[PDB]
Amino acid sequence: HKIKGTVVLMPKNELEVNNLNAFLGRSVSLQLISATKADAHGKGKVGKDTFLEGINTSLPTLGAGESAFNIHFEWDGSMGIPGAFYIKNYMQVEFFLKSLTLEAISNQGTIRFVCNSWVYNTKLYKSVRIFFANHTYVPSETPAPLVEYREEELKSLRGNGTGERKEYDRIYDYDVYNDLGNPDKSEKLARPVLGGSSTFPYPRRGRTGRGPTVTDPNTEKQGEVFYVPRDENLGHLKSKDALEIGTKSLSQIVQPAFESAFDLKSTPIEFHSFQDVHDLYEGGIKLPRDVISTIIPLPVIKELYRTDGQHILKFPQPHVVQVSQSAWMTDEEFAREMIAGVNPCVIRGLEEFPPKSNLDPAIYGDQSSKITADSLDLDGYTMDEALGSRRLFMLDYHDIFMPYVRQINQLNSAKTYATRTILFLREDGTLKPVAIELSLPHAVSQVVLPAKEGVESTIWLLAKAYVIVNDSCYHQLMSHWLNTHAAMEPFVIATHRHLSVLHPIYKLLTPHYRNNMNINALARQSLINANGIIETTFLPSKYSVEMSSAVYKNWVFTDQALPADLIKRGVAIKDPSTPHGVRLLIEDYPYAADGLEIWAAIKTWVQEYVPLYYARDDDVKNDSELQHWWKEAVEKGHGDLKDKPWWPKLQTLEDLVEVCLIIIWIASALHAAVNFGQYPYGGLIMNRPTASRRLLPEKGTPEYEEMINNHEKAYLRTITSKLPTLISLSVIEIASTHASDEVYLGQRDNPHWTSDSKALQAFQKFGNKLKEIEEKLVRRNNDPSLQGNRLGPVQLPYTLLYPSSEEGLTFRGIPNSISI
């Protein structure tokens, strides 16, 4: 009556960022739980404590850091078929359980458990850790002897909403963004609570429970570690893959070290020519020994720079200068990066002229554009013909920036304009910028037109920089932080609270959450906190995160679907005669054209997976875990917007498909497209400035004369200063790196995630289509008719939506999740 089992675990030291015999004896007990035989109270019968017997060295399938143990369970004919197990760790040190495999049992001959969980000493847990077999069950199909265990494990994951969360807790719950300020250190570091009001609505984040500050009971006190539920806090076999901790080290160690060197006046405070900037990746920058000594031993940080270990630090050469050092300065590239750059999804089509503002004129005055139709060079078209043939588009930030420019322009080292850019689609299918409008409140507007000669060519170059400062802010805080990182976290929380590990939709979605809560927590601690990396390098300083709350007011879940976005922005129209059901108005638009192929692939996968478990609309309605999950994700997780009419109701098969498709799209391809191009395009600070420090010089001043004689200096005085540049380059270099243990779209981290062979086959064909799509995109980049937008004058093929990637700074590869 003995069942042979194999346990696979990883000792803690393998996964730490920096013998086996101790696991034998009576150090680790497992008890099997019956799926088919119940006790008096209807719960599956539990077997006896069984201990690890010996090491299994002759297991061929083991990966790095993994060890296997033999175990034998006495299990007689009264016990039935195992469907779960308890495990108790009596050691003092936690370990990472991977799997349990039982042999020669059940009609399938083998029962597989995939656990991937941290198991601490049984004393630290209020209830015993339980793990289920790899079957998939909607709630009403749960074997009756497991139903109660399923419900109790979910209760355990929800907690009660009280207490300070400890490292070993696995408790998922919501709180507002009240942990970014630090008013107990200084009132200067006070920040508004984001979330829970109509003024400052925001997605919720993971609750940590550290308790209130003394100066403000609405704000959470600081802590050395921002808690995440334990199995969200990913360990890695290689310390260099722990990218998420780099922002912490950059903020706490590296940044102070850089600041010291500059205050020392050992390095010049400012760039004085463009060559000073290019030197950063050619010969490097000389810094004091003390400062280099702080970098070279730090894991993760030590990979960002070449160094001789004493005085020289050198950044990698950014892709956007790999061929032409100057091409970024062309109007062609400026426009091309709005459809193929780091932030390719804000441009809008223009259907009337001039553009209008929606801001209240009683407060802001007339905000109607001062651009005149007759002033534009539209390659011979008239305005009427350009409008009617859908060849006018705008990159418009006026209404986003104008209600904040007064507050920003009062900061010491910040000056900005609210901008509008007009773009004309030429006959060759490339976009041409034809006007920039620079606005100030109280409104004052200057229109700048393209010029290649004279003083007006410098005013135009600077005007482009003010536009890109707007765009960089919007990219970092809205396109990137708000729309991917922050919008996704509530869905992660709700999924673990309300869908069992056994649930088919849990298995569909959870790979697309990998590392998301982890990076978000570390970001709240060191990236978007008061005086953190964003606040000290990007234009809006202390207003940065609140701006993203102002924009979240206009966030609509169903408008995150790629076809809906394209139609909403007026760059595509509905067309059922086309493959994707939408016709692009910029035909070669590289982000959208490739993205539609990825979107369609995900859609087929979701459409082939969901019907395996839901045959009719009523099955969706009658899934209580699914209904509670969606109710809480809307009413709590995105609860400041719970009264909007556009939320799906989750009453049909079609709704469930669309809800899961949008979530997967956001976590994978959308985040990839806006994230992994940051250093390739923005590693040159002149191409993607993060801040502007002055307004345009007035005629008759020294600054204006400087413009005439020394345009490179005029440009550098206006954009990001040298010291914040070094910090921002470092953080976007981290963000643009693929860890070697990344899981890419089309892959999973274990081949036994379900026992359902039909789901496995559907997942196999998904991965097969992704390979077909990659070949198609490779062909697009080699098509000479598409070079103008897919490569441009920088000659940088658009690879950001290729599915697969090796490790490193590759400018390709779509991860499953928001993992950095």
Binding site for Fe ion (CB under 5 A): 675
Q: Is 738 annotated as a binding residue?
A: no
Active site residue 134: no
Distance, CA of 209 to CA of 207 (rounded, Å): 6
Which phi and psi (to 5°) does residue 692 adopt?
-120, 145
Q: Which residue is nearest to Fe ion (CB)?
A: 675
Q: Is 436 annotated as a binding residue?
A: no
Q: Point out the catalytic residue in the list 134, 343, 516, 675.
A: 675
Nearer to Fe ion, 502 or 528 (CB): 528
* Closest to 352 (Cα-Cα) out of 326, 371, 379, 329: 371
SS3 of residue 405 by DSSP: helix
Q: Are 72 and 5 in contact (CB under 8 A)?
A: yes
CA 735 to the chain's CA centroid: 9
What six digits make up the tokens of 11?
Answer: 């000792």
Residue 320 identity: V
Q: Point out the catalytic residue in the list 505, 671, 685, 773.
A: 671
Nearer to Fe ion, 470 or 675 (CB): 675
Distance, CA of 422 to CA of 326 (rounded, Å): 23
Q: Point out the catalytic residue in the list 236, 319, 480, 638.
A: 480
The nearest distance, CB 478 to Fe ion, in angstroms, is: 13
Nearer to Fe ion, 482 or 530 (CB): 482
Distance, CA of 407 to CA of 592 (rounded, Å): 35
The nearest distance, CB 739 to Fe ion, in angstroms, is: 13
Which phi and psi (to 5°) does residue 220 adopt?
-85, 140
Q: Is 503 annotated as a binding residue?
A: no
Looking at the DSSP bridge assignments, the partners of residue 307 are 313
Distance, CA of 673 to CA of 681 (rounded, Å): 12
Nearer to Fe ion, 498 or 688 (CB): 688
The nearest distance, CB 521 to Fe ion, in angstroms, is: 13
Distance, CA of 430 to CA of 296 (rounded, Å): 45
The nearest distance, CB 674 to Fe ion, in angstroms, is: 8
Q: Point out the catalytic residue in the list 485, 498, 503, 512.
A: 485
* Strands across the sheet containing 306-307: 285-286, 312-314, 306-307
Dihedral (CA of 740, 745, 746, 751) sign: positive
The nearest distance, CB 481 to Fe ion, in angstroms, is: 8
Active site residue 480: yes
Nearer to Fe ion, 466 or 811 (CB): 811
Active site residue 278: no
Q: Is 820 annotated as a binding residue?
A: yes
Nearer to Fe ion, 433 or 815 (CB): 815
What six digits make up the tokens of 263?
Answer: 């205050």
Q: Are 222 and 267 in contact (CB under 8 A)?
A: no
Residue 717 identity: R
Distance, CA of 725 to CA of 477 (rounded, Å): 17
The nearest distance, CB 766 to Fe ion, in angstroms, is: 24
Q: Is 516 annotated as a binding residue?
A: no
Helices 487-498, 624-632: inter-axial angle, 10-degree rounding? 150
Nearer to Fe ion, 675 or 810 (CB): 675
Note the residue count of the chain: 820
Kindly tell me the burial class for residue 97, based on how many C-beta atoms sit within 10 Å of its own C-beta (0-12, 13-18, 19 or more): buried
Active site residue 485: yes
Active site residue 422: no
The nearest distance, CB 809 to Fe ion, in angstroms, is: 14
Q: What residues form the annotated binding site for Fe cation?
A: 480, 485, 671, 675, 820
Catalytic residues: 480, 485, 671, 675, 820
Q: What residues form the annotated binding site?
A: 480, 485, 671, 675, 820
